[PDB]
Amino acid sequence: VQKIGILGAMREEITPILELFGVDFEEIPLGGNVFHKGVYHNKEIIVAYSKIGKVHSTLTTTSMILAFGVQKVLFSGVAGSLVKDLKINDLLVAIQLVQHDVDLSAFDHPLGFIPESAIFIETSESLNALAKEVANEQHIVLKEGVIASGDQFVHSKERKEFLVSEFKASAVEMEGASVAFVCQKFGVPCCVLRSISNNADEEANMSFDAFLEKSAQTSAKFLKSMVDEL
Amino acid sequence: GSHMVQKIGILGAMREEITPILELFGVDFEEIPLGGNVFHKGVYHNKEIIVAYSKIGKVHSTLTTTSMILAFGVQKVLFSGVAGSLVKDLKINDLLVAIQLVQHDVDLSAFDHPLGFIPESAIFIETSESLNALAKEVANEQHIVLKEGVIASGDQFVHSKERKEFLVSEFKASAVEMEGASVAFVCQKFGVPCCVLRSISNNADEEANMSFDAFLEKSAQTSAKFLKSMVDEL
Numbered sequence: 001v002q003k004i005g006i007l008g009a010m011r012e013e014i015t016p017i018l019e020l021f022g023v024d025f026e027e028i029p030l031g032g033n034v035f036h037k038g039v040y041h042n043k044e045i046i047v048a049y050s051k052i053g054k055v056h057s058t059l060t061t062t063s064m065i066l067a068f069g070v071q072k073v074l075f076s077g078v079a080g081s082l083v084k085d086l087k088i089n090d091l092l093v094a095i096q097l098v099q100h101d102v103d104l105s106a107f108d109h110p111l112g113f114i115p116e117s118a119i120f121i122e123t124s125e126s127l128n129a130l131a132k133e134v135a136n137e138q139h140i141v142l143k144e145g146v147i148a149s150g151d152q153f154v155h156s157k158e159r160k161e162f163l164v165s166e167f168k169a170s171a172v173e174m175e176g177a178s179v180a181f182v183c184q185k186f187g188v189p190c191c192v193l194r195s196i197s198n199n200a201d202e203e204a205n206m207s208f209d210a211f212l213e214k215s216a217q218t219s220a221k222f223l224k225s226m227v228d229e230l
Numbered sequence: 231g232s233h234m235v236q237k238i239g240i241l242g243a244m245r246e247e248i249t250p251i252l253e254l255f256g257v258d259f260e261e262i263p264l265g266g267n268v269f270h271k272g273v274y275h276n277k278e279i280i281v282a283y284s285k286i287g288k289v290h291s292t293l294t295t296t297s298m299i300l301a302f303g304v305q306k307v308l309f310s311g312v313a314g315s316l317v318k319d320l321k322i323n324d325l326l327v328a329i330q331l332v333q334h335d336v337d338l339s340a341f342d343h344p345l346g347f348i349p350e351s352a353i354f355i356e357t358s359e360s361l362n363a364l365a366k367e368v369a370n371e372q373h374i375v376l377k378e379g380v381i382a383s384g385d386q387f388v389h390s391k392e393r394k395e396f397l398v399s400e401f402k403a404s405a406v407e408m409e410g411a412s413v414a415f416v417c418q419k420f421g422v423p424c425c426v427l428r429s430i431s432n433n434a435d436e437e438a439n440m441s442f443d444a445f446l447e448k449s450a451q452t453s454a455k456f457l458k459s460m461v462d463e464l
C-alpha cells in the first residue's frame with residue numbers, strides 16, 4: 001500500500017489540507033507533533049505541521065519517515081518573494097534548496113556548505129515533473145526556482161539581495177531545505193511547494209498576516225491535485 | 231520498560247569526537263548505517279551503547295538524534311565534543327556542562343518575538359538535572375574542574391569579537407557550538423534525558439579557526455574521557 005507524508009510548518013498551512021481531503025483522520029501524537037493518519041483513494045496519508053524552523057522541520061520529517069514509513073513527502077506552505085517577478089499568491093516548486101544561514105567560511109568553505117554535504121539540495125525529478133504536468137493540465141501558473149531556507153524571517157532588502165546574489169534564490173522560507181535534506185538522507189522522494197505571501201521586505205510581517213490564509217489555501221489545493229494523480 | 235537492558239545513545243558531531251569514545255569503551259561495535267549516519271552498537275557494563283557522529287550543524291544533529299531515539303530505542307543521550315569559549319574563565323581544554331541551551335541564530339523579531347524564540351516552543355531548552363548532577367559528582371571524584379552554564383548553538387562557526395559580544399549580551403551564554411541545542415531539543419520532545427558536555431578548543435574570536443584545528447583532537451579526548459567516566463557510573 002502507498003504511504004504519503006504531507007507536511008506544513010504551521011497549523012494554518014495544514015488545516016485546509018485536512019478539510020480538502022475530507023476523510024476521517026486518526027491523531028497520533030509523537031515527538032511533540034500531531035500526525036493525522038487517513039486513507040484517501042487507496043493511499044495512506046500522514047499529515048502534520050512541523051512548527052517553524054529547521055530543527056522542528058527536520059525532526060518532523062525524520063519522524064514521518066522512521067515512525068510512519070512514508071515513501072514520498074510532499075511539503076506545502078507559504079514563502080517570501082526575493083525577486084520582482086515572483087508576486088504575492090504565485091505558486092513555486094523548489095527545484096533546489098539551500099540552507100542560507102550556514103556559515104563555515106572561517107575554514108574556507110563557501111556560504112551554505114557543510115563538510116560531508118552540499119550547498120544545494122535536490123528534490124525529486126519525477127515529483128517535480130508531476131507538479132509541472134498537473135499545473136499544465138489545470139492551466140495554473142507554476143514557477144520553478146531555488147528556495148533559500150534559514151532560521152530567520154527575512155524582512156530587509158540587505159538580506160534579500162544577499163540571498164539572490166549568493167544562492168540565486170527566488171523565494172525564502174524556514175523549512176524547505178531541511179525537509180528536502182532529510183528525505184535525501186533516507187532516499188525518500190520529496191516535493192516542496194510554496195505560495196508567495198510577502199516580499200521579504202520592511203512590510204513582510206504585515207503582508208504575511210494579510211495573505212497567510214489565501215496563500216496557504218493556494219498551496220494546499222495544488223498539493224491535493226498532485227495526490228489525486230499519484 | 232525501565233526494567234529492560236538500558237540503551238544509551240552517545241553522540242558527537244564530528245568523527246574526531248567519537249573516535250576516542252569507541253576506543254575508550256574498547257568493546258566490539260557493530261556498524262549500522264542509516265539516514266546517512268553510521269551507528270556503532272556495543273554492550274558495555276550490561277547496558278547497550280549506541281555511538282555516532284551526526285555531522286556538523288543543526289539539521290545534521292536533529293536528524294541523527296531523532297534516529298537514535300526512533301530507530302535505536304535509546305533511553306538517554308549523552309553528547310560530547312568541542313566548543314568555543316564566550317567567557318574569560320573558560321580556557322582551552324576546560325569542561326562545561328550545559329544547564330540550558332538556546333538556538334542563538336533564530337530571529338523572528340519581525341513579529342516582535344524575542345531573539346531565539348519560535349512560536350509553540352521556548353528560548354531555553356533544559357537538560358537532565360540528574361545527569362548534570364552525576365557530571366558534577368564525577369568531576370569532583372575525578373578531581374576535574376567542571377563549569378556549568380548556558381550553551382548557544384547555531385549554524386555559523388563563530389569567530390568574531392562582535393558575535394561573541396552579542397551572544398553574551400542576549401543569552402548570557404558561556405560557550406558556542408553548532409549542535410547542542412538541537413540535540414537537547416529533540417531529546418526534550420521525546421522525553422529522553424539528555425546531557426550536553428563540551429571541552430573548549432577555541433575562543434570564538436578572530437583566530438578561532440587556528441585554535442580549533444590545533445586543539446580538536448586534545449579537546450575531543452578530554453570530553454570523551456569525561457563522558458566515559460559518566461557512563462561508568464550509570
Ligand SMILES: CSC[C@H]1O[C@@H](n2cnc3c(N)ncnc32)[C@H](O)[C@@H]1O
Nearest residue numbers: 009078079080153154173174175200
Ligand atoms: C512566522 S515565521 C515565517 C513562516 O512562513 C514561512 N515564510 C514566509 N515568508 C517568509 C520570509 N519572508 N522569511 C522567512 N520565512 C518565511 C517560513 O517558512 C515560516 O514557516
Ligand SMILES: CSC[C@H]1O[C@@H](n2cnc3c(N)ncnc32)[C@H](O)[C@@H]1O
Nearest residue numbers: 243312313314387388407408409434
Ligand atoms: C568545524 S565547525 C565547528 C564544530 O565544532 C563545534 N564548535 C567549536 N568551536 C566553535 C565555534 N567557535 N563556533 C561554532 N561552533 C563551534 C561545533 O559544534 C561544530 O561541530
